[PDB]
Coordinates of C-alpha atoms in Angstrom, one line a residue:
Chain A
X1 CA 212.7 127.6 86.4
X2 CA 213.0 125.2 88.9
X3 CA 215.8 122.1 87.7
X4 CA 215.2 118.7 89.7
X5 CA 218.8 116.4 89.7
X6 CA 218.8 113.3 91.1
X7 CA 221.5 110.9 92.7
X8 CA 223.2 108.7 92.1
X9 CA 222.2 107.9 88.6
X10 CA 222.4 104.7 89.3
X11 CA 222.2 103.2 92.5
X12 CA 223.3 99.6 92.9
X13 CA 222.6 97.3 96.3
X14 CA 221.6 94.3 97.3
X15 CA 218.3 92.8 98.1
X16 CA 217.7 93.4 101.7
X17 CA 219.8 96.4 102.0
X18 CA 219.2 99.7 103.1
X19 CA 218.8 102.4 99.9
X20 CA 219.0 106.1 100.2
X21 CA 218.2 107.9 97.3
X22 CA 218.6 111.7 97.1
X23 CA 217.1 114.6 94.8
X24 CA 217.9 118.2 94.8
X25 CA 216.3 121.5 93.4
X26 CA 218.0 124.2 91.7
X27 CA 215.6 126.1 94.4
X28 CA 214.0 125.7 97.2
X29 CA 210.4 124.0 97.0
X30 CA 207.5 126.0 99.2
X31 CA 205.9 124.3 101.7
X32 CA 207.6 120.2 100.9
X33 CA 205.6 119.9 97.8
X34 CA 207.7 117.1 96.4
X35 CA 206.3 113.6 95.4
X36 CA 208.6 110.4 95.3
X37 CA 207.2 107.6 92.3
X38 CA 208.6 104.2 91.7
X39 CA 208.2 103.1 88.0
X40 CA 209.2 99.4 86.6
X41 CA 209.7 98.2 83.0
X42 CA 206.7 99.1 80.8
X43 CA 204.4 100.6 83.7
X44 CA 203.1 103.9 84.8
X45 CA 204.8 105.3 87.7
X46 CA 203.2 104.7 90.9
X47 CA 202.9 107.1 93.9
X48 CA 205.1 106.2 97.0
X49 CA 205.8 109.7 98.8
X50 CA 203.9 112.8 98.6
X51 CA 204.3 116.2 100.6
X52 CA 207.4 115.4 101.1
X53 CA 206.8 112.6 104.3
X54 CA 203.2 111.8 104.0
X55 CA 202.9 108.0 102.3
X56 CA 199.6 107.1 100.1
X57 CA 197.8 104.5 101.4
X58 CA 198.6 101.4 100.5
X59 CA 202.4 101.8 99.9
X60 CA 204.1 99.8 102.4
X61 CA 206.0 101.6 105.7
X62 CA 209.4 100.6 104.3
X63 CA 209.5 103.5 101.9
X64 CA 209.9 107.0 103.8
X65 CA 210.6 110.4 102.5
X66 CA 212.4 113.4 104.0
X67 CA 214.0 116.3 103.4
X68 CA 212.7 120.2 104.7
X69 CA 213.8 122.1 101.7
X70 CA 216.1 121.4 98.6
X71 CA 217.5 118.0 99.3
X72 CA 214.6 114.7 100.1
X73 CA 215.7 111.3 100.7
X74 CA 213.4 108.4 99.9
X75 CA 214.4 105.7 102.2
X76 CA 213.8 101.9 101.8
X77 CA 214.7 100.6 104.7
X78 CA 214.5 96.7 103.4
X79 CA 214.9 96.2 99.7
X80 CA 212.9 93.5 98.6
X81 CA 213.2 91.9 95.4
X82 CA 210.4 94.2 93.5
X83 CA 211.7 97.2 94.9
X84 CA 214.7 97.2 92.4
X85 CA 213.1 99.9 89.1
X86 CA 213.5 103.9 88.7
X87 CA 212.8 106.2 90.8
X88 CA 211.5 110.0 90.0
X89 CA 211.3 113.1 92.5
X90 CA 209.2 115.7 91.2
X91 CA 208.5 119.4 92.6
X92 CA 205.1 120.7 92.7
X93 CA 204.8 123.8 94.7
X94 CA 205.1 126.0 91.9
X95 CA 202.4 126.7 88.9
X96 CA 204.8 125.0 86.7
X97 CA 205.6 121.2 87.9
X98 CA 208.7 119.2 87.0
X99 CA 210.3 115.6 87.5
X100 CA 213.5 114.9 88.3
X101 CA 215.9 112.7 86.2
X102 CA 215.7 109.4 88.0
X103 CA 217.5 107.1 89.9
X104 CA 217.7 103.7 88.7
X105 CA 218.0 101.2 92.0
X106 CA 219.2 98.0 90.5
X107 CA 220.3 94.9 91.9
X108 CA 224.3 94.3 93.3
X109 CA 226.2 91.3 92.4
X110 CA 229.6 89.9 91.5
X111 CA 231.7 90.9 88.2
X112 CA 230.3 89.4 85.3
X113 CA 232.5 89.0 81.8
X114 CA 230.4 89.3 79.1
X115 CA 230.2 86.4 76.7
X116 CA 231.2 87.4 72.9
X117 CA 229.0 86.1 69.9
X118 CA 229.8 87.6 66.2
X119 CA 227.5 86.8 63.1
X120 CA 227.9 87.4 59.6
X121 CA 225.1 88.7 57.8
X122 CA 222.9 85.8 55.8
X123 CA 223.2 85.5 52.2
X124 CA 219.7 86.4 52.4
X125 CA 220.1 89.9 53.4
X126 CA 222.5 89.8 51.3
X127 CA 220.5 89.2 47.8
X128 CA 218.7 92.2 49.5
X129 CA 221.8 94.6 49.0
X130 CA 222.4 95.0 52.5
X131 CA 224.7 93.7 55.5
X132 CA 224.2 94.1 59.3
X133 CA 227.0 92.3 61.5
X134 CA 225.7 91.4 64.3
X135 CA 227.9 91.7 67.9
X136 CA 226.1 89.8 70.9
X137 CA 227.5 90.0 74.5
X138 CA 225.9 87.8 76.6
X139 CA 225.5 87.9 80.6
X140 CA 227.5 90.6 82.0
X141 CA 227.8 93.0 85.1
X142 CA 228.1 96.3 85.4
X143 CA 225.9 97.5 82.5
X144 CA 228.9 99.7 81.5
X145 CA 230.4 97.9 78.6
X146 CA 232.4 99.3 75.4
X147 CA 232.2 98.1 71.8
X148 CA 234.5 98.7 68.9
X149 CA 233.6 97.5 65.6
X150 CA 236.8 96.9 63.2
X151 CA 236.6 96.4 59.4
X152 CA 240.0 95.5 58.0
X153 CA 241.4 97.3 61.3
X154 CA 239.9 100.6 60.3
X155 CA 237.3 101.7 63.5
X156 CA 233.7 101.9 63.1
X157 CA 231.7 104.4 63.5
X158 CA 228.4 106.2 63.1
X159 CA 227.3 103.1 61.3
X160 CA 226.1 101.1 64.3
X161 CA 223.6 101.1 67.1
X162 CA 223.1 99.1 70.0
X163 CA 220.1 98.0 72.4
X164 CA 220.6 96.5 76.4
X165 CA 218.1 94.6 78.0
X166 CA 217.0 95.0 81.2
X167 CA 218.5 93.6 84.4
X168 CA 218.0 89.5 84.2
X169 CA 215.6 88.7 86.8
X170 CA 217.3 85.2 87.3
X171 CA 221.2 86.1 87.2
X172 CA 221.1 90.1 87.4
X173 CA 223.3 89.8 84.3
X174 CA 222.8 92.4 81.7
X175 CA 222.5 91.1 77.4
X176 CA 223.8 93.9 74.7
X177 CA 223.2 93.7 71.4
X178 CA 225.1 95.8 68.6
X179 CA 224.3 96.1 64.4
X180 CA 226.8 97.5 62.0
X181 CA 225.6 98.0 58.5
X182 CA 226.8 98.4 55.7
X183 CA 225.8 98.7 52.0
X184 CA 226.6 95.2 50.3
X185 CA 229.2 97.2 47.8
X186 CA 231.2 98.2 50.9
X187 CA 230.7 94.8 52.4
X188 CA 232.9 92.6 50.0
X189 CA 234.8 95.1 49.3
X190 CA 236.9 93.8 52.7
X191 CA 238.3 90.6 54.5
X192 CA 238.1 90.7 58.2
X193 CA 234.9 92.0 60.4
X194 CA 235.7 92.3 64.2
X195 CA 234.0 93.7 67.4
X196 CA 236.0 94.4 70.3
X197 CA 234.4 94.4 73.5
X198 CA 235.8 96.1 77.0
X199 CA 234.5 95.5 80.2
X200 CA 235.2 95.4 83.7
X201 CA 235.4 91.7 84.1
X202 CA 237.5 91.2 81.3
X203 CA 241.3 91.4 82.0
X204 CA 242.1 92.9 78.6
X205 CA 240.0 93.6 75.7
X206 CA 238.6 90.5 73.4
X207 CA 238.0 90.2 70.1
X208 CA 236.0 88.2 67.9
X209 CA 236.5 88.2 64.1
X210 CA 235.4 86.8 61.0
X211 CA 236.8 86.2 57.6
X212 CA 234.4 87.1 54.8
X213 CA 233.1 84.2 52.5
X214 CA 234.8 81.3 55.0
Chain B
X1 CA 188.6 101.9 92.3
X2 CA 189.1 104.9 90.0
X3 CA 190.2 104.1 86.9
X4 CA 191.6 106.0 83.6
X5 CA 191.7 104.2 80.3
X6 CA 192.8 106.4 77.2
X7 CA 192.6 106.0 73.7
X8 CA 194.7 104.0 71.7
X9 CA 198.1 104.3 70.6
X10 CA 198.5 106.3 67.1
X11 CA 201.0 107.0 64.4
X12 CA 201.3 110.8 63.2
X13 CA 202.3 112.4 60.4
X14 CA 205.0 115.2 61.2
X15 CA 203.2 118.7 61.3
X16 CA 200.0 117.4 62.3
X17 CA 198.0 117.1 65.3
X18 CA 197.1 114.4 68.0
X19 CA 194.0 114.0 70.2
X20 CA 194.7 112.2 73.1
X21 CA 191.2 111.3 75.8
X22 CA 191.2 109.8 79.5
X23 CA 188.0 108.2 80.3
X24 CA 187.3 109.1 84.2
X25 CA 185.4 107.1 86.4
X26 CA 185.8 105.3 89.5
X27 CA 184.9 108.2 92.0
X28 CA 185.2 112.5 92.0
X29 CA 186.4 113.9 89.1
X30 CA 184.9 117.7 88.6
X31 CA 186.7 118.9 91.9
X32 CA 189.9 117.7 91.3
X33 CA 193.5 118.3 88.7
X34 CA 194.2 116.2 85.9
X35 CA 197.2 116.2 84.4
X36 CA 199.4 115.2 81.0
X37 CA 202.8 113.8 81.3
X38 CA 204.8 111.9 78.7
X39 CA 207.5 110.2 78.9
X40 CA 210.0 109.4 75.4
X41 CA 211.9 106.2 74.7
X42 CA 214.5 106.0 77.2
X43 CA 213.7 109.2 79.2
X44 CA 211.9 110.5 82.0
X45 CA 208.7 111.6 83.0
X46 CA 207.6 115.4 81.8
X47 CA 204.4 116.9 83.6
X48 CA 202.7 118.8 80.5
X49 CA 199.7 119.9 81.3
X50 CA 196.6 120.2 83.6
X51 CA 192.9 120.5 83.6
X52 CA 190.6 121.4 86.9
X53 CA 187.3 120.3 85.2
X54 CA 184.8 122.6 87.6
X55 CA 185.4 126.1 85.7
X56 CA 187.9 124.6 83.0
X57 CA 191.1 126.0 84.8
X58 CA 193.8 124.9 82.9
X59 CA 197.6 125.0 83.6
X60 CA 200.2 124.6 80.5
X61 CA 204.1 124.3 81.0
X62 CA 205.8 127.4 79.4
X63 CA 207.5 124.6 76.7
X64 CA 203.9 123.4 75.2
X65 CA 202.5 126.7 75.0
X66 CA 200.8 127.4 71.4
X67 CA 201.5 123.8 70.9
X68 CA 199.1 122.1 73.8
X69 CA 195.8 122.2 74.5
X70 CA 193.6 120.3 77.4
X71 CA 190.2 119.8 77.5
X72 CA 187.7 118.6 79.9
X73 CA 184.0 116.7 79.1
X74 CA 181.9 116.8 82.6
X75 CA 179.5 115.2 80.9
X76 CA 181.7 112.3 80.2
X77 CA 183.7 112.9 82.5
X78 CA 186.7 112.8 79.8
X79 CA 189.8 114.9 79.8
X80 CA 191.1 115.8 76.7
X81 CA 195.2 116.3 75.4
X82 CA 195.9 118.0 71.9
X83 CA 198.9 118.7 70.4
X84 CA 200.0 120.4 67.4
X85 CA 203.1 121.0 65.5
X86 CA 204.1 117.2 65.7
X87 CA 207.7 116.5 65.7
X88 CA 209.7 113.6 66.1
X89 CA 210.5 115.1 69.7
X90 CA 206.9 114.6 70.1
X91 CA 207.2 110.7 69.6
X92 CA 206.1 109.6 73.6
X93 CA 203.7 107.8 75.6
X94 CA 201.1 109.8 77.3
X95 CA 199.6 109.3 80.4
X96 CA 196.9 111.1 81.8
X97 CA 197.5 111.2 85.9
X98 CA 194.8 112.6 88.7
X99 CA 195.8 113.7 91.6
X100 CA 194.9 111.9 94.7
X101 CA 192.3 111.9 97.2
X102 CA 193.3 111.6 101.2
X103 CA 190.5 111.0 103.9
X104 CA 187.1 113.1 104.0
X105 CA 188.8 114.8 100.7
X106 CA 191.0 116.7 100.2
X107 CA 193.5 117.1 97.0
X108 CA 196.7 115.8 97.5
X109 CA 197.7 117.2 94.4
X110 CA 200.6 114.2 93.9
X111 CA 199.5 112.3 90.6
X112 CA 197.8 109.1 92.7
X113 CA 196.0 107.5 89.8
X114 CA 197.4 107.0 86.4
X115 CA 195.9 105.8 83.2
X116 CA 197.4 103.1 80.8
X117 CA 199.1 105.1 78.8
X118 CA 198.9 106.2 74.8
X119 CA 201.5 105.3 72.9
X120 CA 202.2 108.6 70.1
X121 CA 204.9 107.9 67.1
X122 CA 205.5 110.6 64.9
X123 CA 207.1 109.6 61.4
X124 CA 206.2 108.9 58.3
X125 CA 206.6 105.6 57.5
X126 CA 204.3 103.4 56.1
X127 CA 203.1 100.2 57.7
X128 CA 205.4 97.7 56.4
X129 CA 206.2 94.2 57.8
X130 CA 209.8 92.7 58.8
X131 CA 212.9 90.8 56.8
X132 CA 213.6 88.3 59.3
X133 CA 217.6 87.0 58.7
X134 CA 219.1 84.1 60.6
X135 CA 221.7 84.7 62.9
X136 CA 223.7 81.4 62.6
X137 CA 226.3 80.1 65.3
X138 CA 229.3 80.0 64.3
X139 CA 231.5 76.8 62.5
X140 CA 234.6 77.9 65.1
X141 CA 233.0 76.7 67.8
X142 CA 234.1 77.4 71.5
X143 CA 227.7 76.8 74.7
X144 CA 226.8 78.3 71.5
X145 CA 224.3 81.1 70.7
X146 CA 222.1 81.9 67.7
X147 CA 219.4 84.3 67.1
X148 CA 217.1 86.4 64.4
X149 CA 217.6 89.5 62.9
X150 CA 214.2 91.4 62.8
X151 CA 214.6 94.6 60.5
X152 CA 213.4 97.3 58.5
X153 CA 209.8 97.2 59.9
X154 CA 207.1 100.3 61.5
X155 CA 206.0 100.9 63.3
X156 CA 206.7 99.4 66.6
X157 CA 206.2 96.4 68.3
X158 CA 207.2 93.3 67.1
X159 CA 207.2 90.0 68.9
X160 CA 209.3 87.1 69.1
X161 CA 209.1 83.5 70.5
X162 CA 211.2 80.5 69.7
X163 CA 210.4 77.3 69.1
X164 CA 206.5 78.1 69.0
X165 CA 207.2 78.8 72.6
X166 CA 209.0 76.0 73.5
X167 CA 212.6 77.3 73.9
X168 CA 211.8 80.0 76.8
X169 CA 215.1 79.4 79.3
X170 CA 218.3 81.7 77.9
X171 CA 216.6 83.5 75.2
X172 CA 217.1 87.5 75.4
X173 CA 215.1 89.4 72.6
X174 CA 216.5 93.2 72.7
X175 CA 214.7 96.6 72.6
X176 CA 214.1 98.0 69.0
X177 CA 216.2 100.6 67.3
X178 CA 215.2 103.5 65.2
X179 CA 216.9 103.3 62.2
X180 CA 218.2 106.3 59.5
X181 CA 215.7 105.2 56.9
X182 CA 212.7 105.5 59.9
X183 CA 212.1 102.0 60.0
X184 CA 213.0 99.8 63.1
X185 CA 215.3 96.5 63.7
X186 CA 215.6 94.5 66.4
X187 CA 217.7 91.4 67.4
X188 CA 216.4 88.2 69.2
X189 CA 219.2 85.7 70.6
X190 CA 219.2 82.5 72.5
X191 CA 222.2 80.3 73.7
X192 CA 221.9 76.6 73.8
X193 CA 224.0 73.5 74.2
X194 CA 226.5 73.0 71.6
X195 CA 226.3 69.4 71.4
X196 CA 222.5 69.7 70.4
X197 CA 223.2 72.1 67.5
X198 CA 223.2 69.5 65.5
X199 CA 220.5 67.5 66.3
X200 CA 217.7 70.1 67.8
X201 CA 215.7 72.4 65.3
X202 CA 215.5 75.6 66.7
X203 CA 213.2 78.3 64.8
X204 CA 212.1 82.0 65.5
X205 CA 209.0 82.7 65.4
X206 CA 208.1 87.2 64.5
X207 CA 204.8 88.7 64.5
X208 CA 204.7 91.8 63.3
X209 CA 200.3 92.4 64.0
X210 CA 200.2 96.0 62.2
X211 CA 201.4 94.5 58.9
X212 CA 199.2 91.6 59.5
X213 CA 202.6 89.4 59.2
X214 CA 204.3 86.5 60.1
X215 CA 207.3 84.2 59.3
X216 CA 209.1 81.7 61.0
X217 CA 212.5 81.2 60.0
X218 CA 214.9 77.9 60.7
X219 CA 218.4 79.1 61.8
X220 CA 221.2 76.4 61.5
X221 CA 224.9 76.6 60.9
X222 CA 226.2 78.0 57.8
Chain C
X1 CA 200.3 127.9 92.0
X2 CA 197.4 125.7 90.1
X3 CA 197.7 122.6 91.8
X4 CA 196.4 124.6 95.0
X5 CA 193.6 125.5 93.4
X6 CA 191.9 122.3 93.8
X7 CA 192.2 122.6 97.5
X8 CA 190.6 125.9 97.5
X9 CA 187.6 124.6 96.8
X10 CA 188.1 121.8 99.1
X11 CA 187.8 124.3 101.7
X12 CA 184.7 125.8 100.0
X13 CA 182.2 122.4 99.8
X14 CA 183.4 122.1 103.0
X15 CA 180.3 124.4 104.3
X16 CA 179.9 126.3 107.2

């Protein structure tokens, strides 16, 4: 059936700045039936564009939509601050409707290192059996960032996930947060717990570490 | 203004099946589409579903056929989501979208108004309230940044505030993850002077309101 | 397609 991909995935520019985002069908859609929604953090999508050009009322004139077949364009002529969320295309002149992938339009702004934070797991959790190491990196940009966890040098994984917040709405910074765990009987069992982090504003990678039981 | 509020959200066992209802009012409802769409953790919207309420047309997408059914209440005007077979590819919020209206009518059929959303979980779980750990700054000092570790609870959410509310500037309190034993941890942080580490008290305060719990836990260095 | 449908009748209330 009909496949909607949107692009870029993410699409990063600064407030005041003109945004063109684009979404394409795997075939073309009869007669413009494509809608453009905007969606922020914890809120149902909202109508901007619908039949391809035609704007619900009250969204403002700054948002426009085009396209005449396979490839529309909502335009935002002037991004202001709350226009910054994800954006969704989705094809409706077919019996069988579909949404795009989104775009998420973000805010622009200079390289940000992220700042490294490792902590041990508490003797509490510990009495429990238990131990999460916990890898914070604090106030970065881009979102892309890389993290390694090390035990005794040997790499880490399928025994961690990770959570980022969203865009700060203060510094534009993103905050990562990664958990290792471990059963307490392989915890003990070695010295030296590290996470490496790589990132775009860091020259090389860094490393923080801890010894286990100092 | 039209409005939509649906049903609250709802755990599920795996296998089972979930109701889901839309209370219409506002304006019109018998002469124009309603539709489903949900939207998992993380992902995008996915149009389900849709209900014309006049002769009970309905529309399903080819993926939730023998799976989804939609039901509309004129009498109520209610529309109605059901959904069998639970898995945890089900685990979504719902929304329940009508399409909109232009000038003397007219469908626009572009989802205009849109409820609040149901939030569906399917796992199996039992209500059970959070360990809260201490994550303490570090002796090796370098600003330094402590935070809470808030684990092993279900279902979702649980909230977090320091200081009873008074430490607000710097804190960053992460999106929950699902866990291999089905039970969800999340990780609260804050970053404060260094020079007041040893003279301000900070605590974390976690409310976990389906387990009807509470703690709050002072975090100092080790 | 469905999401016509409701037109349809759109065009039908809308008497002669």
């Amino acid at each position: 059936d009909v496949v909607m991909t949107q692009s870029p995935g993410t699409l990063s520019l600064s407030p005041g700045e003109r945004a063109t985002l684009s979404c394409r069908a795997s075939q073309s859609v009869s007669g413009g039936a494509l809608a453009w929604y905007q969606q922020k953090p914890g809120q149902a999508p909202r109508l901007l564009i619908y039949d391809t050009s035609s704007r619900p009322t009250g969204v403002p004139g700054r948002f426009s939509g085009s396209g005449s077949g396979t490839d529309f364009s909502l335009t935002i002529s002037r991004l202001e601050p709350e226009d910054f969320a994800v954006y969704y295309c989705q094809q409706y002149g077919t019996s069988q409707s579909t949404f795009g992938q989104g775009t998420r339009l973000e805010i622009k702004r200079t390289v940000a290192a992220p700042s490294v934070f490792i902590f041990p797991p508490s003797d509490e959790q510990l009495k429990s059996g238990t131990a999460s190491v916990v890898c914070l990196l604090n106030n970065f940009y881009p979102r892309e960032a890389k993290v390694q966890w090390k035990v005794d040098n040997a790499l880490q994984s399928g025994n961690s996930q990770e959570s980022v917040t969203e865009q700060d709405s203060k510094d534009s910074t993103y905050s990562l947060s990664s958990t290792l765990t471990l059963s307490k009987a392989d915890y003990e069992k070695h010295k030296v717990y590290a996470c490496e982090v790589t990132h775009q504003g860091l020259s090389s990678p860094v490393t923080k570490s801890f010894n286990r039981g100092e | 203004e039209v409005q939509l509020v649906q049903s609250g959200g709802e755990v599920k066992r795996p296998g089972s099946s979930v109701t889901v209802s839309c209370k219409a009012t506002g304006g019109t409802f018998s002469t124009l589409a309603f539709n489903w769409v949900r939207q998992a953790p993380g992902q995008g919207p996915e149009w389900m579903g849709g209900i014309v309420p006049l002769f009970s047309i309905v529309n399903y997408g080819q993926k939730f056929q023998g799976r989804l059914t939609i039901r509309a209440d004129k009498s109520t005007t209610t529309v109605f989501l059901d959904l069998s077979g639970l898995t945890s590819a089900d685990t979504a919020t719902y929304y329940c979208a009508r399409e909109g209206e232009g000038w003397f009518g007219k469908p626009l059929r572009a989802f205009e108004f849109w409820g609040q959303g149901t939030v569906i979980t399917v796992s199996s779980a039992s209500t059970k309230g959070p360990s809260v750990f201490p994550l303490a700054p570090s002796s090796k000092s370098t600003t330094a940044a402590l935070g809470c570790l808030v684990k092993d609870y279900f279902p979702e959410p649980v909230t977090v505030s320091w200081n009873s509310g008074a430490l607000t500037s710097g804190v960053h309190t992460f999106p929950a993850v699902l866990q291999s034993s089905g039970l969800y941890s999340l990780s609260s942080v804050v970053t404060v002077p260094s020079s007041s580490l040893g003279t301000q008290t900070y605590i974390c305060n976690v409310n976990h309101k389906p387990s009807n719990t509470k703690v709050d836990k002072k975090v100092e260095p080790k | 397609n469905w999401f016509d449908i409701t037109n349809w009748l759109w065009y039908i209330k809308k008497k002669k």
